[PDB]
């Protein structure tokens, strides 16, 4: 019926491992790029989870490039996938740590190994590590905790600041508790430079005030002047690239045992 992506099992999938793939019939699949044949080494997110110096946001910058795809059926030597048509309903499988509820917007995130390190049907270093289809309001929440832990990561030498971090990685949502760098440089370039460059621009604009809002906005070298504002706006572009989490689903109703949920596919 729909779009088709076949996955050629370069590794030998034992019938018991097929028994685990035949349980994940609904589950999402991160595909690197839309093509009809892909290897099992392509299919999945393990090629993203792999570097000595690889940061959470950089993986999220990679996964945002990866096309979401949905498992259709596992026929032995092959995995059949469907790139989901936008706007249609899809039975995706709740392989995240969070129970879904009727009406919620679901966002793909890379799985975090903080207290919930997980693998799959692995043989020869390839498992099928599966992205946390997490609710959208918690997806922004998880992002904010990761940056604030990293903004406080330099001041480990204070125990009180370390006790501020000790509360911080405790993430608690409906029926679920889980534990959790240039992006924080990007946070700090906006925090410091907007403090200094706006003062010559508030006092000039505050005379004429159409929406009547510049009045309490005041209450709140031209080459180097633009050089600040260039490296102001481009760092604002860099953080907004890794903030707007591009929502992926809308669960209409949840199948019982919370394994699956019919989800109309959005974005």
């Amino acid at each position: 019926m729909e779009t088709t992506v076949l996955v050629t099992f370069e590794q030998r999938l034992t019938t018991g491992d097929v028994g685990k793939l035949s349980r994940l019939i609904g589950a999402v699949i991160p595909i690197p790029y839309r093509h009809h044949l892909l290897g099992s080494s392509q299919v999945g997110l393990d090629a993203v989870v792999k570097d000595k110096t690889r940061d959470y946001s950089r993986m999220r910058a990679r996964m945002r490039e990866m096309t979401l795809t949905i498992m259709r059926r596992v026929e032995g030597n092959q995995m059949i996938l469907g790139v989901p048509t936008h706007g249609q309903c899809y039975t995706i499988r709740n392989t995240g740590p969070v129970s879904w509820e009727k009406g919620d917007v679901l966002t793909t995130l890379p799985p975090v190994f903080s207290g919930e390190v997980t693998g799959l049907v692995s043989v020869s270093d390839w498992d099928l590590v599966l992205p946390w289809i997490v609710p959208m309001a918690l997806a922004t929440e998880i992002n904010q905790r990761m940056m604030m832990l990293a903004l406080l990561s330099l001041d480990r030498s204070h125990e009180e600041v370390r006790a501020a971090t000790a509360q911080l990685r405790v993430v608690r949502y409906r029926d679920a508790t889980l534990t959790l760098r240039n992006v924080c440089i990007s946070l700090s370039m906006i925090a410091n430079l907007s403090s200094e460059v706006t003062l010559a621009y508030v006092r000039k604009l505050a005379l004429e005030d159409s929406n009547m809002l510049l009045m309490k906005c005041q209450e709140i070298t031209p080459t180097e002047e633009l050089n600040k504002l260039t490296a102001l706006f481009v760092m604002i572009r860099q953080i907004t690239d890794v903030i707007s989490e591009q929502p992926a689903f809308l669960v209409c109703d949840v199948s019982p045992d919370d394994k699956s949920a019919l989800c109309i596919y959005k974005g």
């Binding site: 779009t3 076949l6 009809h36 000595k52 110096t53 030597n77 092959q78």
Partner: protein, 361 residues
Amino acid sequence: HHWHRTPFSCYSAACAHTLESVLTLAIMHHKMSPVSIAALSRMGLHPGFALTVVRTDTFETDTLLYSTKASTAVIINTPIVTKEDRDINTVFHVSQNINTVEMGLGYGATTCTAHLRRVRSDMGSRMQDLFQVFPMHVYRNEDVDAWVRQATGAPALLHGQRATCEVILTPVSADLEFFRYPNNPRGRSSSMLGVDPYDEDAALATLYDHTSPDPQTFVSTNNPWGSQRGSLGDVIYNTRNREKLGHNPSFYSPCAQFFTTDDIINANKTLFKTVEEYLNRSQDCIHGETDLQYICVEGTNSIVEKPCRFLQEALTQHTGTTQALMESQLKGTSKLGLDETHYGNYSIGETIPLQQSILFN
């Protein structure tokens, strides 16, 4: 913590007086700053070390391939059709699911390197700029950073892609022996065929136990600065250490197939699965449509690699130190084989006579 370290005094205690020790102690007072090496080699003054430039050379080559009669059964099926709808240009993808069950007992096929078509590499003497390889690493001082990046590394091609990498080595090291015979540029030959077919601790004893002897020389280490774990060859040219560190993965590095600890520990699986690994994971090629040398992105050919990952030796080409030696090599129509040493000089002969063979063809 002293500036003057021990070999100053232990040189002066046996130094030879009268106008040469007086000045050579002041030449031993040359700084080892990066900008000191910069101005030093800039004025041509040779710094207190000797480096070894390594280089790959890509040869587009006809490979003949025998295959025995009815070797492997290509089991196939009916090529089935699917239809993707791209709304004005619909695409019928069509597929044939095929397996290949194996041949017999032995290998029922063999590849033979037969005829060089081209040399994609130029055999150039470009340099692998680590300012571009590791783009993140700069100095803590703005002024020194700008001085270095204007000292070096702040559209055109005629012989195919340029190829290079780098190793630092002590200036004692025997050009008289070690460079005459083809080796590992790490200093200590780490060939996995020498070590036992699975023993990881024995393989680590080959690589980094320098109290264990070197294979194939028994002089246990030629470059201590670039053979040890955490040596300068190791912290820069291993991809494990290079990936602890912040680098660009795009660049090809002929050092990596020597200095990668884990990628040569993984070539320690059972002498025939060794060569099956050599056939399976030969997907580290060089991208075709690039000026310099960047690795391949999505394969498409299991190329035959070099004897590294298999024999772990790099060749040497013909290497005359002075053009006196080089013009006495190529005076008239002569070979690139003479090993000749002038007192402070050397001519390292080429192993595979490529300067003879590609001239012949």
